Amino acid sequence: STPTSQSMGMQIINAEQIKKMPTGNGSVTELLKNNPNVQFSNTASSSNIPGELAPENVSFHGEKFYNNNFMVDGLSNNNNINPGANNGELNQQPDGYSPADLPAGGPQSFWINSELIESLEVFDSNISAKYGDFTGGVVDAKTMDPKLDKSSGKISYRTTRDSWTKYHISEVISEEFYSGTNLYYQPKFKKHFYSATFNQPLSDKAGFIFAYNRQQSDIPYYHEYLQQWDDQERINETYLLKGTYLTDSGDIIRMTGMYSPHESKFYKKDVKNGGFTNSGGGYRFNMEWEHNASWGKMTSLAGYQYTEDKTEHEADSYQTWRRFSSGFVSNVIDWSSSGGANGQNSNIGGYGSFATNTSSFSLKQDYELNPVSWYGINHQIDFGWETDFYTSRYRRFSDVYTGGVLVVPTGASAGSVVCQSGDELCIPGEQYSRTRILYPERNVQVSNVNYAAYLQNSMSYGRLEVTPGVRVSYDDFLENLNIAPRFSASYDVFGDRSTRLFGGANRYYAGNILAYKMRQGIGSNIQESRISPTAPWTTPTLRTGTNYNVSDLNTPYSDELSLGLSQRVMSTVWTAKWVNRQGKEQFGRETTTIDGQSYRVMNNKGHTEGNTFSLEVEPISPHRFSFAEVNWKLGASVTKNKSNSIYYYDSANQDEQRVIFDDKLMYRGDIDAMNFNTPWRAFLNVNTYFPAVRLSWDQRVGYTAGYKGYTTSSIQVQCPGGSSACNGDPSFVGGATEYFPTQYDDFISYDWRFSYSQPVYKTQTLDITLDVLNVLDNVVETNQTGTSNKPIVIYKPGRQFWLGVAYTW
Length: 809
Ligand SMILES: CCCCCCCCO[C@@H]1O[C@H](CO)[C@@H](O)[C@H](O)[C@H]1O
Ligand SMILES: CCCCCCCCO[C@@H]1O[C@H](CO)[C@@H](O)[C@H](O)[C@H]1O
Ligand SMILES: CCCCCCCCO[C@@H]1O[C@H](CO)[C@@H](O)[C@H](O)[C@H]1O
Ligand SMILES: CCCCCCCCCCCC[N+](C)(C)[O-]
Ligand SMILES: CCCCCCCCCCCC[N+](C)(C)[O-]
What we know:
There is one protein chain. The protein is mainly beta. It has a single domain (about 5-315, about 350-400, about 440-525, about 560-645, about 675-705, about 745-809), classed as TonB-dependent receptor, beta-barrel domain (Maltoporin, Chain A, Beta Barrel), CATH 2.40.170.20. It has a 27-stranded mixed β-sheet that branches. Strands 17, 18, 19, 23, 27, 33 and 34 form a seven-stranded mixed β-sheet that branches. Strands 1-6-7-4-5 form a five-stranded mixed β-sheet. One of its GO terms (cellular component) is cell outer membrane. This is TonB-dependent receptor plug domain-containing protein. It comes from Pectobacterium atrosepticum (strain SCRI 1043 / ATCC BAA-672) (Erwinia carotovora subsp. atroseptica).
């Protein structure tokens, strides 16, 4: 059995516990909301953005949001190229809009639905040497296994809508919002979730399981100027197939296969054929071999996993044409993109396709030895190793041409454009392009190999438990070998199990980013010119634009200290604990100069702190108090998190800037963190079951410290005189931007889930499921944008209904 000091710092959510928490989009990170050690992006749940299907972003003890280890079925599900794009916030032009974009796709490469999952193991504190490639938390999601006894199976269906959603939108925006001209202002929409599961035995000793799961979301979108309604789309799919076979020997062989594409359908604004789609996800193949020997257990795995973020546009060339201007009106340009009174231009097309992928083959092996007493104490030993050979690419699939400067001869020479038979950049009689920019077919490619091994020894003298462990890893990307001591202890103060202390000190090293590699060539373009529209294209010249590059880096780590205490007061367990995290050597941005050419490059100048006091109360067993039965759980936390100005790996170092902030003139690097920094929150869950009418009545209540919004001075406060804070440093001379707080008040969150089951033909049932999400519909500020000039507040979703129908057998 696992050591008591490590369980103290992990969560376990089995499938029946999952079904009893009320949910929107079922997604992995959503399930973390009952964990007092985690926080979410200020924008992660917002009323502007239903219809969106991605996973929320999460940060453990205020560590980076892209420094978590997300696993599925114990294997990595992390994007190690570009996971923290735009520090996790959305972009009015999602990445791929523009020709020279590095695709994003976020911290998880497979977006797995909250069905499909048997158990979720969530480690945040005193983590095991067995787990690496994180600074923050570990989030292992175990999919459904086959059963060998019966032929289970289920078909579900589930939906929500704009009708059914009550919105909260600022005014200021409400005009623009309801026009539906903004991608991420979605007033009208429909989500649809299908699922199908087949459990299937073959022998007394072998069976498989097929599962499928589709989430889809349609969002209308309008072009002013172009004057068209197009439909945005969001599709997530998961196909899953697992066999298991028990040998004559008593050893076990498993085999998994997964395919988890997701895509997002977008539109370049007011552009004829402006469409483009952003595919993500990929697939897996496992093969796993348990062996049960006299000494212990030995599980040996081989795996392969292709994952890919690709942007693909409706067309592979882009033009900007003129509809009309002084002296000119086209017979051929129907549409417009601008609406100027005296001049209108018309954009058409797009920037080809292009992508990043990672192909990777993995070989794990883990040993669980049987306990062994030696020199008077028990030795639970684990050890193991693993190695991963991977290859990352970026590719533009084919040459994409953009139109350059325009000509529109008018007046004396008004009709005189004479085109070439094939010429995509010439409209006979009207207009042509003098220059033309070619973004070329390209390819950049890394192939690497990481190695890791770990040894742990949980020893116990009775009363005591003390588990020193080591994880050693080497990435040949940075070529660093890192050694991570993990230490975790526990003491029982009087037999009993009534009163136990525990603590520990550990170090977690992160995995790779490697975006700066993939961007190396990126944004190369070759521009040509021509005198007339029958001249040949003449003077090709290669520009690179912003150049990116590799540098000599340390691997970012996080150091931990923990101390806690678990009391059993009555028939109710009160466990309270402290954790502190120094996050160190965190990647950021530098501009460096090589040969007169300049280069964006990664540094190790970021840093973070995390400090959390967490309490947790939970009764021993449910109350049967009588005609129904009720269980309950209660979490709470107090949380101070810190940060540089280096928010993520593409943030430049603006620490030495001077900034006014709360009343006194100070350096920017020392100001409060403004994402993942809610000072406290408490939450209670109550699951109620009325067996008399087969009705489940699940409620989540929560009281939460309010948001604190900031805005900034549009104009820098110049400083010898010009603010009475300039005296905080009389010598200082220069500018400084002032931050203006608005402290919103603490708020009550309240969520419901009903689930009624109903027999149909003996062994079958039909299940009705209803979620009421913001029950009181009360308004809460989540996030604040803009200068003081124009401040914009964003709110948490109002009351929302989800309706589900399941059919089991
Ligand atoms: C279980 C074995 C996997 C079977 C899935 C085969 C279908 C994969 O389809 C492919 O997947 C990649 C990422 O999704 C894309 O980049 C490819 O262009 C696409 O054709
Ligand atoms: C768990 C600890 C294992 C240590 C292995 C260190 C390997 C360092 O050795 C390097 O590894 C590269 C990638 O594998 C090779 O291609 C290089 O030739 C070699 O310099
Ligand atoms: C068994 C008792 C568990 C509680 C451990 C006390 C942890 C105190 O630890 C301290 O907490 C401060 C917060 O006020 C932080 O400012 C400091 O960084 C930290 O050293
Ligand atoms: C038994 C379940 C198998 C899943 C069937 C999925 C069928 C659709 C495959 C994708 C094709 C696109 N579209 C829009 C028709 O769905
Ligand atoms: C892991 C076993 C699952 C195998 C399923 C293979 C998917 C077949 C492709 C059908 C079309 C899928 N897509 C992307 C169009 O939706």
